[PDB]
Amino acid sequence: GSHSMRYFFTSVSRPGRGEPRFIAVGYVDDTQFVRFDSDAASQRMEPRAPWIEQEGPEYWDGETRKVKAHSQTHRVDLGTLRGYYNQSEAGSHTVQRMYGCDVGSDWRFLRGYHQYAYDGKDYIALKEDLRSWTAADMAAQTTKHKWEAAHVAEQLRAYLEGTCVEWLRRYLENGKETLQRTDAPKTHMTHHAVSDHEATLRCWALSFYPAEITLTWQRDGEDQTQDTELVETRPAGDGTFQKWVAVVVPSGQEQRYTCHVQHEGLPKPLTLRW
Amino acid sequence: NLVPAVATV
Amino acid sequence: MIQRTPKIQVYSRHPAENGKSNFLNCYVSGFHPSDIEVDLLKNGERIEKVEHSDLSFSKDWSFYLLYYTEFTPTEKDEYACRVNHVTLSQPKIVKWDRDM
Numbered sequence A: 001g002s003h004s005m006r007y008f009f010t011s012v013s014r015p016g017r018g019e020p021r022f023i024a025v026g027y028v029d030d031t032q033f034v035r036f037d038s039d040a041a042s043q044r045m046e047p048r049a050p051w052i053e054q055e056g057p058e059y060w061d062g063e064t065r066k067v068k069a070h071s072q073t074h075r076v077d078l079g080t081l082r083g084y085y086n087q088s089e090a091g092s093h094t095v096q097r098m099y100g101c102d103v104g105s106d107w108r109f110l111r112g113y114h115q116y117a118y119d120g121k122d123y124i125a126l127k128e129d130l131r132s133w134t135a136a137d138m139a140a141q142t143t144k145h146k147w148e149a150a151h152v153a154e155q156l157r158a159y160l161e162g163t164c165v166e167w168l169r170r171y172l173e174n175g176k177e178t179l180q181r182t183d184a185p186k187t188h189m190t191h192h193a194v195s196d197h198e199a200t201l202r203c204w205a206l207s208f209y210p211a212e213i214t215l216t217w218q219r220d221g222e223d224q225t226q227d228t229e230l231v232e233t234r235p236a237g238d239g240t241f242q243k244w245v246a247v248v249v250p251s252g253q254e255q256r257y258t259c260h261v262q263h264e265g266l267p268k269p270l271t272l273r274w
Numbered sequence B: 001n002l003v004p005a006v007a008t009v
Numbered sequence C: 001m002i003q004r005t006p007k008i009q010v011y012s013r014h015p016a017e018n019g020k021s022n023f024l025n026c027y028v029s030g031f032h033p034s035d036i037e038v039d040l041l042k043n044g045e046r047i048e049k050v051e052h053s054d055l056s057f058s059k060d061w062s063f064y065l066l067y068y069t070e071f072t073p074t075e076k077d078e079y080a081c082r083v084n085h086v087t088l089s090q091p092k093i094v095k096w097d098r099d100m
Helices: A057-084 A138-149 A152-161 A163-174
Strands: A003-012 A021-028 A031-037 A094-103 A109-118 A121-126 A133-135 A186-193 A198-208 A214-219 A222-224 A228-230 A241-250 A257-262 A270-272 C007-012 C022-031 C037-042 C063-071 C079-084 C092-095
Touching (some): A003 A057, A057 A094, A057 A138, A121 A138, A138 A152, A214 A241, A241 A257
Antiparallel strands (some): A094 A109, A186 A198, C022 C063, C037 C079
């Protein structure tokens, strides 16, 4: 199947005194592997997955230096953006950056991305061709002109097609025992009665990896969406994921309803009944 | 492996 | 400023059985800005040894965090997650329901 490496960065200004809170996290697919927190004692990029510890002291020195550069750009950014938007010094503001690369089943480059937000809103993003920019407003258009003069897209494209792809390939090999393994959802169903005429059926999927999954109800073999509740896919905390979907049914008619699970760890779609 | 450089806005 | 209210789910890491060590999770998501307060509660009282994930966000820029504590479920103890955010007038409490 396909794979990705993605980095996420949040900086939140602290008006009264000092520099912003900066948090960086790195992912391969749904596995977090590195972190940096400016409020932490070490002031180093830290491992969050056993397989990244394979990497030597040069790696960690290099990543630390780069993540600190990221942090300084963000600090500069908060001040510039405050200027662009004519805002006071009194309020706390936020910048968010995400970037990374996708590869298909053959592990070849599929797409790359680099997007940026200010106070939760689209600011500027690299386009799919990795050659041009999407600026949301006139502040972002000023940045686009600046990044065009300086050929920023060209530098990002090289990373996204090269290093990004090359180091994801490297990470997938080193962590193959977990990263290249699929864990099938463990499924069951529960029953509840609200009154002597109405019942709830809940279909559970547990302990699955990767996070992507589809859970749906059918009634007499037709898709049923009305009277269903589908929760957001949630982390178990051991690296696996969980999700459920529920349907409300007339008591006694439970047998008409089937739950259907699709997941990349299941060669065939699974079906459950009460 | 992080991008070598990050341009400011 | 955009302000998005947190969604809350409270659940255990593993199937919940009395006398058997487990982890109590409170997952907060879909919120902005990132400042948020989250407590796990035992019989209405704040649990002291609570840890949380590193801050990250979804494609739509909204933040998510997992808070969690080691616990051993029993028949009698009641558990909940208490959340405060800029978007909430009063702290929101969600009770853990093991029967779900």
